Amino acid sequence: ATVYDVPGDLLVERVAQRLKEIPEIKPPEWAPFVKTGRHKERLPEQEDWWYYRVASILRRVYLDGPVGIERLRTYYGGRKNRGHAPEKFYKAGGSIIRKALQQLEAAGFVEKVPGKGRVITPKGRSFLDKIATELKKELEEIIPELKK
Amino acid sequence: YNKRKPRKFGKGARRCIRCGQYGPIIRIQGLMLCRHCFREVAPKLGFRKY
Amino acid sequence: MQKARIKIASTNVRSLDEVANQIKQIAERTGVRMSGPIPLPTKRIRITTRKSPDGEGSATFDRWELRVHKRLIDIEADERAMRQIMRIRVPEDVTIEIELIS
Amino acid sequence: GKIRQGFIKRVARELVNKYPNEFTTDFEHNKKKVQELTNVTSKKIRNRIAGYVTKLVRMKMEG
Amino acid sequence: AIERYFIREAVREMLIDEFLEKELRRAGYGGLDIKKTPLGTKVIIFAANPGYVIGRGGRRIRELTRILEKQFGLENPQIEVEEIKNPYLNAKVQAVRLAQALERGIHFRRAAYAALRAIMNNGARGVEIRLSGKLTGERAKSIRFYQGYLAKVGNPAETLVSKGYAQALLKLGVIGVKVAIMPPGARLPDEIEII
RNA sequence: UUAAUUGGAUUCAACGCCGGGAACCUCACCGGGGGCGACGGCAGGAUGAAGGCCAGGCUGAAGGUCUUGCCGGACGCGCCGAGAGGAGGUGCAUGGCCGCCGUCAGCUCGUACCGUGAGGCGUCCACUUAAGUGUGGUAACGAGCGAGACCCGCGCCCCCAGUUGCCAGUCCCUCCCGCUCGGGAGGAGGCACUCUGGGGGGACUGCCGGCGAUAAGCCGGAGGAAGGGGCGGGCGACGGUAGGUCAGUAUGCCCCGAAACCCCCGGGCUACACGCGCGCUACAAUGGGCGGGACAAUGGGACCCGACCUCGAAAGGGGAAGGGAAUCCCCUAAACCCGCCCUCAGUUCGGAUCGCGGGCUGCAACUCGCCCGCGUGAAGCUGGAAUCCCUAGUACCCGCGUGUCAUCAUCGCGC
């Protein structure tokens, strides 16, 4: 079983609650005061939003292999209203995801291929697919059809 | 003193090679022609209506 | 083993097919394995322009399109085969680029 | 806008007058015979001539 | 880039076309063609009077050979001059000829009719001559003389009919002439022959 | 109003039009300074320049000029002819181009016929067509342009060939996990589906029945992926509108010639009590905010696409792979739903409007760019007579990209 056999929402929730325990991942002192994206209008509501970002960003490294900062910014970007002018699609912040990637890289879960991106270490794959097969067990019990 | 200043940017930098107007110069892979002059040379360039 | 990658490009389809047939006949007459002519995505250059020469009149526009077509010929390396692609009679509009790949 | 054009109504009459036995009620058959007998390059006009000669051959035996 | 090179070579060839049309108004400039070889650019030109392009002692062509290698930045323009086989089958050539005729004090009805009869005599099929401008007064007028088959609409007309626009200068003004020539060799798509 | 808001254009058919590019340039507007004048005729000539050159001052500026003193060696200009140029002008003085009556359904020619003639039929009538589309009668018969035909792209199928595409099947090798069933991923190697594109077929009132003169053609039916102008266009003839375009090209005519020439710069083309048109948004609980995920596509990229490492919130900086096009990048689409929060309010809507501090570009943006974040929060809480347009991948509605292009468009384009 793998992340590909389980929903993204539940898997990111599991990775977030699990990684909340680890001490290497922590929101920086400027995280609670700076919104997750330029395009955002208000500040984040829940105080766990940092770990979710990590819980998502590593999942991205699980799927795309090599990842850099700008493509992450484009993905996390969104639609912001420009008043009298129309809504426009903008990129998100870069420093937050850069710090999350650095914390994960110190966590050993992700590594850097210079000139190609950030890829996922075998240990990171093991942890992610372990959570995914945990969830697949649970959802097999909830939904027997997932046995197939 | 009778020299025109050297400009790389702006309309004053770009001029149509055929007519000489300072207005509409389409630069799709380097044509340097005005937009209306483009019609008087359309079928010599290989272009075809569709 | 070595291969030569021959990219032919032209506007008129007939000239490109003519040169492809000449290359294929030469490759078969020289008895060289040739990967057949793969027709690559034609590039479509589309230009829109308002037909009004002045600021007066209904806004009418015209779109003109170039369809520039390209083909790929991957042949195996053979000097006797490579000596018979510089002698081919090439129509002017056809452009041929012959590179080598390990 | 069905109406078969004039020059089709003109071509078909001669075509079936010269080679009446050649054509039958089958549309594909008469279409291939139009293709081999005439020099049309437009598939559409070939098939239109085929349709009109199909109907014509059909009327040949009704009276 | 292929897209940055095809258009560049085309536009240079056509700038040469326009430049030579300007330079060869008296020579009945009929057509141009370019070939590229490592030796250089073989420039083929079809004109109605090659002797006029040659002029005297090849002086004129040599001078043209100068302009091309300086004005347009070409590598060895090798200019060869030839004659058009049937100048009455080319719209542009007869258009320029009629423009020159009207520039010579030749009456519009007479000259247009004479050119039409000549082109019909050369084996053409369809002739159209539209003359526009001040013709019989201060006001401007347009008159069209046509003879024979000429379907003006459709893709075939774009592909089989030769068009030519010329402008004739006179003290009263500039007179436009549009010449459309349909040769006999072409075939309209509605023409099916029995066997 | 201003020195300037340059000018062209007037209802349909101008009014996000020229403008598919006003910070200088665009410029054709206003102020200021500076310098051009082809060549003939006459004069000077060269006994030395016509061009620059300081020390300095009048110039926003420069041997521009000025006292100044030299060259560099050699023709400069004064007037009459008369230039080069002119976005200086006259678009009922033109060519072309565009607009609409209009892709409309019409317009023409030979002979014959009628009429003293201006001229009539053909081109008329019944049915029918998108179409002077075709058919039965007709003093007429033949024939041309137009529309049709034709050309482009689109969906169903198949051959040819693939450095597009993949736990399609996948021995062997690599990684991780598990319930040990298998799950997922790469290499090995293959060419499988779409795909890119060289061709052909299919699809055609083809048939059933009816209608219609049994004709044309129409209706309903079935079968077929698709059917009775397959779908959207290119292709709009004859004249008229004395429409607009000489402020682009060719150009009738007139006019200036140190100017009606050219060059440089400050401003203006953005100026407001205002009227009108068109696009963009704000007038919430569908809702605003946090997090997850199903997702394209037209095209483009060389001082560029710029992936990507790293720093800075950040606009971005240092380095940096690959890329001149199914090879790399732009790359994300957007719409949507849910785990959760907020609780019908001119407010947690909405950001205009100010001031602050940073980023990009360019000689420089206060007239005259935007963005990044901060206190701040306008009007607007569903709008009268009247009112324009679309009709099936279509209306509605939602976004991407790119042209022109450092920036400017809320625009046009096209996906």
Numbering used by the authors:
A (entry chain BV): 2 to 149
B (entry chain BQ): 6 to 55
C (entry chain BM): 1 to 102
D (entry chain BT): 2 to 64
E (entry chain BC): 2 to 196
Verbatim from the authors:
In this study, we present cryo-electron microscopy (cryo-EM) structures of dimerized small ribosomal subunits (30S) from P. furiosus, revealing a unique dimerization interface facilitated by a novel archaeal ribosome dimerization factor (aRDF; previously known as PF0560). aRDF forms two homodimers upon interacting with two 30S subunits, establishing a head-to-body dimer architecture of the two 30S subunits. Positioned close to the platform of 30S subunits near the neck region, the interaction surface of aRDF dimers predominantly covers the interaction with 16S rRNA of the 30S subunits. Additionally, aRDF dimers directly interact with the conserved eS32 ribosomal protein situated in the intersubunit surface region of the 30S subunits, crucial for intersubunit bridge formation to initiate ribosome subunit joining. The structural architecture of the 30S dimers, along with the protein’s ability to suppress the formation of P. furiosus 70S ribosomes, classifies the aRDF protein mainly as an archaeal ribosome anti-association factor that inhibits ribosome subunit joining.
The resulting cryo-EM maps (Structures I and II) revealed a dimeric architecture comprising two small ribosomal subunits, mediated by two well-resolved homodimeric structures of the aRDF protein. In this arrangement, the 30S–30S dimer is connected by two identical aRDF homodimers, each composed of monomers A and B, and remains unoccupied by mRNA, tRNAs or any translation factors. The analysis of the cryo-EM data using maximum-likelihood classification revealed two distinct conformations (Structures I and II) of the aRDF-mediated 30S–30S dimer. The two structures differ by a slight movement of the 30S subunits toward the central axis of the dimeric architecture, using the two aRDF homodimers as anchoring points. Specifically, the 30S subunits were displaced by ∼3 Å toward the center of the dimeric structure, accompanied by a rotation of the 30S head domains by ∼4° toward the aRDF homodimers. The head domains of the 30S subunits exhibited a lower local resolution in both Structures I and II, indicating a degree of flexibility. This finding is consistent with the observed rotations of the heads when comparing both structures, and it correlates with the binding regions of aRDF, which do not hinder the rotation of the 30S head domains. Although the relative positions of 30S subunits vary between Structures I and II, the 30S conformations within each dimer remain similar to each other. Indeed, the structural architecture of the 30S–30S dimer suggests that aRDF would hinder the association of the 50S subunit with the 30S subunit due to steric clashes.
